[PDB]
Ligand binder design. Sequence first.
Ligand SMILES: COC1=C(OC)C(=O)C(C/C=C(\C)CC/C=C(\C)CC/C=C(\C)CC/C=C(/C)CC/C=C(/C)CC/C=C(\C)CC/C=C(\C)CC/C=C(\C)CC/C=C(/C)CCC=C(C)C)=C(C)C1=O
Ligand SMILES: CCCCCCCCCCCCCCCCCC(=O)OC[C@H](COP(=O)([O-])OCC[N+](C)(C)C)OC(=O)CCCCCCCCCCCCCCCCC
Ligand SMILES: CCCCCCCCCCCCCCCCCC(=O)OC[C@H](COP(=O)(O)OCCN)OC(=O)CCCCCCCCCCCCCCCCC
Ligand code: SF4
Ligand code: SF4
Ligand code: SF4
Lengths: 157, 360, 178, 70, 56, 318, 115, 96
Amino acid sequence: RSRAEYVVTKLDDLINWARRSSLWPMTFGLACCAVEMMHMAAPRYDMDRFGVVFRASPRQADVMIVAGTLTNKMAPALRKVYDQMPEPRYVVSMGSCANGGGYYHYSYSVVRGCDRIVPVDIYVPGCPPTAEALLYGILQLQRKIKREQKLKIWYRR
Amino acid sequence: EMVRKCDPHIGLLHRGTEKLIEYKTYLQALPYFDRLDYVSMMCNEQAYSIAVEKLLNIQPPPRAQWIRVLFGEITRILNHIMAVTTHALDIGAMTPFFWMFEEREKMFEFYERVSGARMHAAYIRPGGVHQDLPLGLLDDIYEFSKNFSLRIDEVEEMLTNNRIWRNRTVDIGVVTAEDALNYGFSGVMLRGSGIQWDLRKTQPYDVYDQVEFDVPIGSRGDCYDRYLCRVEEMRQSLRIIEQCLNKMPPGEIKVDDAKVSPPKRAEMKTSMESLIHHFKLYTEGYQVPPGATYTAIEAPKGEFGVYLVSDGSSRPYRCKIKAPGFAHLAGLDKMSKGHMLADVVAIIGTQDIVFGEIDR
Amino acid sequence: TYKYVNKKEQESEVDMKSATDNAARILMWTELIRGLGMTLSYLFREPATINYPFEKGPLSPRFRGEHALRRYPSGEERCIACKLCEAICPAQAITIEAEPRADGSRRTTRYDIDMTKCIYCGFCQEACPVDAIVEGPNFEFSTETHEELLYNKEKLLNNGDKWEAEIAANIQADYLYR
Amino acid sequence: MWFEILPGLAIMGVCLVIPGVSTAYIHKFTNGGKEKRVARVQYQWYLMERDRRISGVNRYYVSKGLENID
Amino acid sequence: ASATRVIQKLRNWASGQDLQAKLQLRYQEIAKRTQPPPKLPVGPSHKLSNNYYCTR
Amino acid sequence: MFFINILTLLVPILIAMAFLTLVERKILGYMQLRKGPNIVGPYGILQPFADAMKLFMKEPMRPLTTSMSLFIIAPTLSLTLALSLWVPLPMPHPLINLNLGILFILATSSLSVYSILWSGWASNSKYSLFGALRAVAQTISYEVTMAIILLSVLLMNGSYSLQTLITTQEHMWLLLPAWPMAMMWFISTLAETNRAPFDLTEGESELVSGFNVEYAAGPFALFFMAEYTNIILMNALTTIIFLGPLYYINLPELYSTNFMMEALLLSSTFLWIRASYPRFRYDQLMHLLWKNFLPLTLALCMWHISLPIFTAGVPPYM
Amino acid sequence: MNLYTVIFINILLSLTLILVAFWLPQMNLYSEKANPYECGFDPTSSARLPFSMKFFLVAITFLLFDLEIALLLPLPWAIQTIKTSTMMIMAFILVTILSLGLAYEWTQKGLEWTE
Amino acid sequence: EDNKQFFGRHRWVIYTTEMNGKNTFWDVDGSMVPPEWHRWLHCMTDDPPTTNPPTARKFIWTNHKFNVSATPEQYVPYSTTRKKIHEWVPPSTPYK
Ligand SMILES: COC1=C(OC)C(=O)C(C/C=C(\C)CC/C=C(\C)CC/C=C(\C)CC/C=C(/C)CC/C=C(/C)CC/C=C(\C)CC/C=C(\C)CC/C=C(\C)CC/C=C(/C)CCC=C(C)C)=C(C)C1=O
Ligand SMILES: CCCCCCCCCCCCCCCCCC(=O)OC[C@H](COP(=O)([O-])OCC[N+](C)(C)C)OC(=O)CCCCCCCCCCCCCCCCC
Ligand SMILES: CCCCCCCCCCCCCCCCCC(=O)OC[C@H](COP(=O)(O)OCCN)OC(=O)CCCCCCCCCCCCCCCCC
Ligand code: SF4
Ligand code: SF4
Ligand code: SF4
């Protein structure tokens, strides 16, 4: 193909490499799934070794790991801290509660899955999913944003 | 930065757990208790199981009781690890969090080896426990526990005599004994204020009257005394774990009553009565005779209570869950008088607060 | 019995040597130095970090993972549409419809498990009288859409066909306990 | 193990020895094999300006010895 | 467990504790992942006589 | 050639800052029984470049309530003052040779405090306001104590230049005569650099992120670069002042190597301290620096007034 | 000239970094994106409200102590004087007076924070 | 394997560079392990599937598939039942 197309593809690879090697989650959790999330932070699995480091403010966050039961009282707050994240942001639902309500699906005060509130990039199943499974979801998200072709789509526009 | 008023708005993790429990059967309502206090899963299982067993007028076998006490003490170690290390993380130090969470990973391996789930085991059930221990588990528990007191000594060296930690915890959130009793505190709060009270010693359950251990008692009622109490009862939990390993008896696992506990799978596949009872227990469940009880269990965070009301059917009519964190967070505003933001962070850390059991 | 965690017994009085020791402790930051030494020892220890995904954390045959539907060695489905798993499912995550097959066999026409609704508790696999539904040890099945976690009978039978070499071995290692 | 820190430590060490060594070499190169003259007082500045006038090339570092004296 | 004696002495002096006796990493003392099959005992009601359910 | 000297000072300092971030991750991990970054690159050495590129390709935040002018001005001010504080250090020859070097250092440090304050006020948020006020209290305490410490040390030295400090420590470190104020200076540098236990402005657990809680992406990167450059800066200043590297007229490379080794050791000590200790409360920091350090600092200042007088060891003017 | 040059180079470098940081990435900003952060909920009141200061007396004392520092700073040139006895006595008097002021404030609880 | 290593790091896998036509030189996946090696690798048993192979069944997949999410081979749910209510079909001949 064109020489400029190759340059654009390599720039896409570089941008995707940077964004997948530096994934900072918001220090945000709701329940037992967030307990497994800090067990992923624990020395056995070392998200920091993978380059994944928690940041407290949503402004410095890249991904949002919805780890727990999203209730009706919590949903505006979750939407607010999602909206306050800057644009290259991703969402990892974790556990059956955040996926589709889970054990509290038919409850009066539970949002039936956080995908009703925020656009979810990756769903991690389990109750709780193990820290292995959450780490697998993080690596799958890294592959997904490695697959992104933003500058190539912009060039083909 | 002084704190004039604390207003804890809760219910942001409220999921209608009591209503779902009253719309499900007893065995179906068991794994909700894993998710009430998701650091004390086996302890809440034990509390609900003792409540249902009291309503059923049946007792679990002694081997089941010893297994339940052993895993209750393992769970107490897990919860006090979480409380102490995340309290230290809120203060500012995270290395004990990392070390003790590696230890938590080993205890999660024990949980997975007995139940298949690392956290929400659903292992302790009315009538005993779900399955017997796999071979070598007691040896691995011994190998973990013989090395664990050194790790506690490591955290204690890191924090206890540290003048920074003493400045952050000493004379912070001082609670008098009469105020703790009136505010309805339980567990670590009462013993930190100096009240000689422990449910495992006063109203014992399972084989806690057969094990022997000491009760840590504070004298100043502050964050430092509560932290010392939690570390010392971690050591006492290790002592009880040693006693349980040495005195684990042989025998069965569930109560030998197929109208409450399900039979073995071989018996179900070879016997008509066992197949009928398996069918009825896993479809309708056992009928609990009508009556009300309040069963209180010394959870790691305090007194975990279940007020169960049974209407005579196979579903509970009412299940009120009493969490110690509810009363502690109600008393948070009193403890924060004349304090700052970092002091409030320390008080929230030292109250041993989890919100699933608070909100339900 | 009980013990005191912070109460001190009697007094140590006052001595010049003890006063000098406390003065050196305050001025020279001795407990801070030994905390530094503890962190230094941890630095020179060996980390407990495995090399995921090339190394996996240990598990047991009891582990409750992704659901699967098994078969007899003849290839006939083990499930007989008895709805015990559906009855005991605490999250109501199982939907079962059934009818007699062309040969008169009692088989399901719909077996759906909402894995976003399931709580991974194993009640289905311990209520199944014929060991049809199991929680095989797969846990790395995270998807990118919510729909892919809504399993049906074809997905569960494909999982049973995929993981039969491991599920059968786990049930062989486990079934004497249950 | 603890020696995996040593690559990053070595990169930091090289990046910390580069500025001082390079500054010394650049001073020596720009002052002609000698260190850059320090004028902390007006006397030293006057010495530097006198050397600059004496050299005849408007560079203070070009020193003139006994070859300018008969 | 693969630490040299110099590093072991340094760690023991820095911690004040004999770390090598109680390592937090499991090497070989743990149980084997494959176990012999068990034979679980039966309960007290597994008898063929004097076991009427109305009496228990 | 002077521009090339500027480049060969500025660029290696920036790369050393980025690998200081990497080495903090590795050292904290190995002190926390884990590994830290070793995937991104051979041994994690591409992780800081990945983080920098991600932050500079993430969009910045411009909140509605926020004063845009000061919000923009504060991070570039912070980075410029970090590099300006780096500029006059002698290793053993400074890029810019000053007479009142430590006075330049003090002025530039206080202006960096102003960068933090203006960021916190411009980001119109309550946590940012908390971070600004905590910065005010912190810099009050360490400013008075550190000024008296540096006064006593340079009274022993004799002048405000730093090549004079090299000549002073030609034969012996100043750690041996002045080790109590060396300890107090080390604590003062921790508080100046906002490192644990005296960080208190980017309060992770007390606040959310403090003064930069509304900052995202590029300006947040500028703040992080300024802070870690200040870490290497203050440790370099500490080893220049107190732990004098071996200086020989015929070869300055030995001085540069010894300075590098001691500065790396002090930076690693900073990371070690962050691992070891829990965070102070910010009134306790002021009480410490005003009740324990300050009376002893005044006493030692009087002692170092007296000492050259009764020993006849008055230092030379030049 | 050289110091001014390197200060200007630092200014240009930081301005270039913040300029490329603001003009390089894709912009997508809306109301909820740029609303202020209050841990997920709306702020009850503006952050420009008065915010009480419990160490105001310590700040005023810091002003006076900073001027005492400014007085003490010409000591490295003062020690070169011929009449070292007068300089030594005056420096001792200044530091002793400063220490007495600090001790008096400590006694009168001025260092303690209000409320 | 290496039994001198501690528990957890004593067994490991070097993944293939290509599996089922996908270039997995860098895109290594945890689901690429077939079930028998999965059991050995997760340490549910001490014996590999070379000295103790699993029981062979004719319905067991001969080719393992990794996680096929966000691929054309992904799983799409559907109702597996047939239509329950059958509508009346009007006649194709007019009455008049
Ligand atoms: C039981 O009850 C409960 C709780 O209670 C206990 C809960 O809590 C709770 C909530 C639970 C959670 C939210 C889970 C959260 C988990 C934890 C709290 C545990 C995890 C632990 C920590 C967060 C502590 C981590 C500690 C560390 C030491 C890690 C280090 C972290 C840091 C932030 C510091 C390091 C910094 C970074 C990672 C970023 C650094 C890098 C940069 C910014 C890059 C800057 C560099 C540049 C810009 C340089 C550029 C210049 C150049 C010249 C480069 C050249 C470039 C070229 C391209 C050439 C729940 C729900 C709960 O139920
Ligand atoms: C750069 C060189 C190396 C520097 C040291 C680097 C390595 C050591 C780093 C350790 C980690 C530090 C982390 C932060 C710690 C913060 C806490 C802290 O330090 O608090 C300060 C603590 C505070 O103690 P405190 O706060 O616990 O004390 C309680 C005080 N009240 C009750 C009032 C609140 O100690 C000091 O303030 C002491 C400072 C140093 C004093 C040195 C005195 C030496 C002896 C002088 C001469 C004596 C004889 C005189 C002549 C006699 C003649 C007969
Ligand atoms: C984003 C906006 C930022 C605004 C703030 C900028 C801060 C810059 C960094 C901090 C500066 C702190 C104050 C420094 C003042 C000078 C210090 C000093 O002692 O300089 C003296 C020195 C030579 O004097 P001496 O040491 O006696 O030597 C004589 C014999 N060699 O040297 C001299 O005599 C040289 C005199 C000039 C030195 C200062 C040059 C400043 C240049 C202007 C910077 C701002 C530009 C305007 C804004 C641009 C757009 C944003
Ligand atoms: S999915 Fe299960 S483990 Fe996760 S938050 Fe819900 S109840 Fe807790
Ligand atoms: S594991 Fe439990 S929640 Fe999941 S399908 Fe089986 S019975 Fe239902
Ligand atoms: S319990 Fe077993 S046999 Fe019965 S319907 Fe469920 S899977 Fe089929």
